[PDB]
């Protein structure tokens, strides 16, 4: 009947073990917060220097770097696995391309450099809106979904640690902070989660890339400002899940420029980096809207898909989020990893001659339709 005190470190001492106990004290406040807003507020109120991750970035091999920052496995292809008058959709989509390119009269941009970019934006907005309208009868969820134009999606997370190399804080250990601030051209948000693409705890032999250098060597720079976790709408919004995201590659990153710059192999890499960064930010933000964070990992895989286009070519990506436990404390013993599926870019049409689009490919249109026909179970 001896009540020995528990063998734990001091709360107030100046030691590593004592600090870790103070970390758990703060984290317990998050576990004890009833509202999802308090959990996010507590998790993000303290601002420090963080790497700013750009989904669209000209850095070489950014896709492999982005996998390490996210713990994402990239699998080439599509995730393992209703008559809709394909001709009717083809006619409407062809009309969308012709309308903006050949028929509408507007005050042209003053810049003389945005004219090509503005044209690409116009058609993609038209294509997305009409397809989400034409395909609504087959998939009723799209009727109640929310269509967003250039809305902000934000995710903030910790992964890894570093020893501060200089200054009065030399030798202190600090976690590596990352934030993705993204503004997808278009995205669709629904009030019901999509079905998973693979079972949680799914395992494959492929290995996430390991980067020898720090994030800086891939040109990446730090700033300190508001930490934000955003899905495109506030937590009060009923439509708290994601269906599909549409991204337009900037003209700076388009195929012809890259070949001239001699970075031919980066044509596909540009698409993949945008998908991995954008979809991890979206799904991770959705998961945190449900109360899941690094110390309370997701119980349900979180899924979203994106189509990434340079205005003519299209690529399709599927993402499944299995882990928000990316921190050193939470990732010490984690068999889970996040999954991304992607396909090579394929043209949707070749050129507009006379008033008829030439080279239109049905196959690419089906992939857009199949993505839009995905429904919650």
């Amino acid at each position: 009947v001896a009540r020995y005190p528990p063998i734990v470190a001091s709360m107030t001492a100046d030691s590593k073990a004592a600090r870790q106990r103070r970390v758990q004290r703060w984290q317990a406040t998050v576990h004890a917060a009833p509202s999802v807003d308090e959990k996010i507020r507590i998790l993000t109120k303290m601002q420090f220097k963080k790497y700013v991750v750009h989904p669209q970035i000209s850095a070489l091999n950014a896709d492999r770097w982005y996998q390490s920052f996210t713990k994402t496995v990239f699998v080439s292809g599509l995730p393992p696995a209703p008559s809709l008058d394909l001709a009717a959709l083809r006619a409407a989509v062809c009309d969308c391309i012709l309308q903006e390119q050949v028929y509408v009269r507007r005050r042209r941009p003053r810049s003389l450099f945005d004219r090509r970019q503005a044209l690409a934006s116009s058609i993609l907005d038209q294509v997305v809106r009409t397809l989400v309208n034409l395909l609504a009868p087959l998939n009723p969820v799209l009727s109640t979904a929310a269509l967003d134009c250039k809305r902000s999606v934000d995710f903030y997370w910790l992964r890894g640690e570093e020893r501060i190399p200089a200054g009065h804080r030399k030798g202190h250990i600090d976690a590596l902070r990352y934030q993705i601030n993204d503004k997808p051209h278009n995205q669709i948000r629904i009030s019901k989660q999509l079905p998973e693409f693979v079972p949680l705890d799914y395992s494959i032999p492929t290995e996430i890339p390991v980067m020898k250098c720090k994030p800086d060597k891939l040109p990446l720079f730090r700033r300190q400002y508001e930490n934000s976790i955003f899905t495109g709408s506030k937590t009060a919004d009923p439509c708290c899940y994601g269906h599909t995201q549409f991204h337009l590659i900037p003209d700076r990153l388009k195929r012809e420029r890259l070949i001239r710059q001699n970075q031919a192999e980066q044509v596909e890499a540009v698409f993949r980096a945008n998908a991995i960064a954008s979809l991890f930010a979206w799904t991770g933000a959705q998961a945190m809207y449900q109360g899941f964070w690094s110390e309370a990992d997701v119980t349900r895989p979180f899924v979203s898909q994106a189509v990434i286009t340079d205005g003519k070519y299209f690529s399709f990506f599927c993402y499944q989020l299995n882990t928000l436990a990316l921190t050193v404390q939470a990732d010490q013993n984690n068999p889970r990893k996040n999954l991304c599926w992607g396909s090579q870019s394929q043209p949707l049409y070749e050129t507009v001659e006379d008033n008829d689009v030439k080279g239109f490919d049905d196959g690419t249109l089906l992939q857009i339709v199949h993505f839009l026909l995905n429904k919650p179970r």
Partner: protein, 48 residues
Amino acid sequence: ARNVLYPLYQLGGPQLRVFRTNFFIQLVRPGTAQPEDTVQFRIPMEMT
């Protein structure tokens, strides 16, 4: 080329050709750890 005048360019002008090069560079060992593709150079201050 450094320490020389460049012919001023105006619309329709020829291409600027430097037949003999005045820029001298040296390959240096990286002080920090760099990706395998990256190579460091010390170049004259007037080189872009």
